[model samples]
Target: SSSTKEAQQQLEQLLLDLQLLLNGVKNYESPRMLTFKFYMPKKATELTHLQCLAEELKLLEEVLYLAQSKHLTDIKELMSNINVTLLKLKGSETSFKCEYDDETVTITEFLNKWITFCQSIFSTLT
Candidate 1:
């Protein structure tokens, strides 16, 4: 009983740490190349990484929502802002193109698999 209690506390703290990490990663922005500001042609690279960040935000949001945690609302707002930025930056949804196509799976498939794993964790807790 005591071990379970401590485990719950640790997981809760881990979630808070995860939120901090999310904010830090979101704010780091991108690489720099100033001057000669006639036409910035390197936005494609930024958008590519941005798309990957958005995917991570989506998965985090899904997990938090499933866990029914208090942090869900803040994460939702953060996710929404990321989506809006992506839309404005790309003019629409753009494919990031998975780097590892040889062993690739859909985001849905990955999310569902993680959900199943989390479900098993919950089962273990009880």
Candidate 2:
């Protein structure tokens, strides 16, 4: 009876091994998403104003380059000074908006995927 039980355990071990082998990849590492998180004021992104500032800066640079038409060096210097200040205060804004975007069949579908994933992992690991 003991030998019969040992053979049954061995059969179960082989079944588990075969199942793992049939799955092809033993472990899966879902690629880490290139998610960019930053601290910003919780508000709308001002796109028009942002692009306007960038364009204005570009135009100012062109004018600065040609400011010294003849004896108008002060215009050039003034532009240089303002450009420095503007560049110093230059900032960034988000270009596009994004949402979670994935629409599952229902909350239950979402729960089965993530809740099961976590429960299985946590039960085995922690």
Candidate 3:
């Protein structure tokens, strides 16, 4: 049970980080090109983050596959949250596609949300 509890706590922390990232995304404004750079302790960590994200996606897929197996309610809700987060992240990649007259704020906001979401997810398993 200790491990489970620890996992839950990590998850909660990750969720909080995710919320913060989402907030950042929500508050970002874009009009000009923005170069987002993050410095991590090591290249390995960066790679690990990508790996973890991939793993999370896979986990979500597996959970969805067994949606009716057990704990459907909780699992489904978590899956939905993960899906929303993933979609937001995906959207951030094409943020530069906005019309010239479009406000940069919306795109920035989306990116902030996505960054926070990812940070939260990585924090959990690290």
Candidate 4:
């Protein structure tokens, strides 16, 4: 019971960090003033992160399901994270179509930054 509660608390913190990341993307500033850039490459990185997050959530879900079915003490709470991550990933996929490329930045580089931010939160869950 205590471990389940602890896991739930950790999941809540991860959800908060994920929300912050989504907010950052929502508030992202475009370099071009005249037209809206989709930043496809950067978005690809975000998508990748989302994919990984989704997979992790799935694993957590399975764990939670088993725990609940077996009446185990360790409960995994990740459905909300999975749902939110999927929605964010879909939004990113729909909006990813940048026309201009920034010579200084690549999609991988941009994604890595975001991934690092996510990893920081993930580390605490363990």
- TM-scores, all models, native as reference: 0.34, 0.26, 0.29, 0.28
Candidate 4's residue-wise lDDT over 63-100, tens digit each?
Answer: 33442322222222234654554554333443233232
Query: How accurate locally, in lDDT, is each candidate?
Result: 0.40, 0.32, 0.40, 0.41
Model 3 global lDDT (CA atoms, 0 to 1) = 0.40
Q: In angstroms, what RMSD does candidate 2 have relative to the true structure? A: 28.4
Summarize candidate 3's per-residue lDDT along 74-111 as a digit string, tens digits.
54465566555444333223222211223333323433
Candidate 1 has a TM-score of 0.34
| lDDT for 62 (candidate 3) | 63
Cα displacement (Å) at residue 18, model 3: 0.8
TM-score ranking, high to low: 1, 3, 4, 2
Off by over 4 Å in 1: 1-45, 55-57, 67-70, 91-96, 101-126
Q: What is the lDDT of candidate 1?
A: 0.40
Candidate that beats the other on TM-score, 1 or 4, i.e. the better one = 1
Candidate 4: 10-residue stretch with minimal lDDT: 33-42
- Tens digits of per-residue lDDT, candidate 2, 23-87, equal 21112211221121222111213222223323433653463344222323544454455444333
